Amino acid sequence: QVQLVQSGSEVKKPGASVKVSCKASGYRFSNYGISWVRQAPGQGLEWMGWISAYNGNIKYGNNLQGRVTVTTDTSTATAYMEVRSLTSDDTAVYYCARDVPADGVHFMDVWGQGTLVTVSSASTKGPSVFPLAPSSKSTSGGTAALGCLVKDYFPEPVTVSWNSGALTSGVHTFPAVLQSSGLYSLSSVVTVPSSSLGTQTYICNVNHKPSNTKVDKKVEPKS
């Protein structure tokens, strides 16, 4: 039950600032440090910094301009990381990890789930959800495929669930493709029993955190 929970996705304008949070459970927070690591999308892990609730000691890897600031609140067992004067090169996923309390070896044994920070001068765009209805053309005997198409959204990410998380088996949410417009698009599909097309309800829960967009689209068969 050692657990680190980070905040949701963030989109910021160039020059603005972001403050990711990292709430710890399952261990004495004051006896451990926190290391912050940056993973640019599709790139390797880069260590950013370390802060110890035990000592008060802070280390930064590369921060001559003072744009990054790692902090902690021991009372609420929460670490924070703040990045200021953001640039498009700061677009990345940020992780917090439990780490050594003093100057020993960093182990980083437990990580948080991550936080995607996107930096763009463009307005955030909500997705258009369209049904990929199941039909005879989308059936191969005892299985039928259905889905929805999430189209024309910026920036990433969109999280697609089915039936509020109750349908996860057989779900393929595809990675997003870059369109000519600069907007993203993906499709989420699922294979179900065709005999159950008459009695089951399949709903797309499309959530776009940057645009505050939450769309539920019911996918119903077509003859």
């Binding site: 992780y95 053309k137 989308s138 191969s140």
Partner: protein, 219 residues
């Protein structure tokens, strides 16, 4: 700071066959306390890294025996005695001994599996999108291996060019198969110009190419 050099960038392995990932370091990882300190992390897609090995060879809780660590000085290796489908993902080596903890580039581990033919489905454009002035036709190749598959769009039997995009899922963590969505995107005018829309799939698992088609009037 220490430079972790990881090899190889990509490692395709067959189920039940071993895998070997090397991590070299610019400076010796033997610390003043006389213990060598190297960690190995596993990152499944969309998830955060999970620590598999600490202190060169020590397995963390819940880490299968199949994962093994070894090494000395600047040269270390992670081995998988028999690779299983649940081993898809990127593997990183990390040193925390020196002032700036540093990681390796990462090794993507892909699974080699028995040939499985795709299940082909086709979804015509919805009516809302047509109202919006665009038509997206979706062709879905489901649960196949190998990754290599040719999808060709034909509109009124004329082969299409330059107006479709493909997306491939991550290799499934259970059956080690892929899925692929080819999306042909047109304007509603181009969509109404023709009636027969088909996607033709060629794959190693199919003896002959499979075509799925629909007529614009019905479905």
């Amino acid at each position: 700071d220490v430079v972790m050099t990881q090899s190889p960038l990509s490692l395709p392995v067959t189920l039940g066959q071993p895998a070997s990932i090397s991590c070299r370091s610019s400076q010796s990882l033997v610390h003043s306390d006389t213990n060598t300190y190297l960690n190995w992390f596993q990152q499944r897609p969309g998830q955060s890294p999970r620590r598999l090995i600490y202190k060169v060879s020590n397995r963390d809780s819940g880490v299968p025996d199949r994962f093994s660590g070894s090494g000395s000085g600047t040269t270390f290796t992670l081995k998988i005695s028999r690779v299983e489908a649940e081993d898809v993902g990127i593997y990183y080596c990390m040193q925390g001994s020196h002032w700036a903890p540093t990681f390796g580039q990462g090794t993507k581990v892909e699974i080699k599996r028995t040939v499985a033919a795709p299940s082909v489905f086709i979804f015509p454009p919805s009516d809302e999108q047509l109202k919006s002035g665009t038509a997206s036709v979706v062709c879905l190749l489901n649960n196949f291996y190998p990754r290599e598959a040719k999808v060709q769009w034909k509109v009124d039997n004329a082969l299409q060019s330059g107006n479709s995009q493909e997306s491939v899922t991550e290799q499934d963590s259970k059956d080690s198969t892929y899925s692929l969505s080819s999306t042909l995107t047109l304007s509603k005018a181009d969509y109404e110009k023709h009636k027969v829309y088909a996607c033709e799939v060629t794959h190693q698992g199919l003896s002959s190419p499979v075509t799925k088609s629909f007529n614009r009037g019905e479905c």
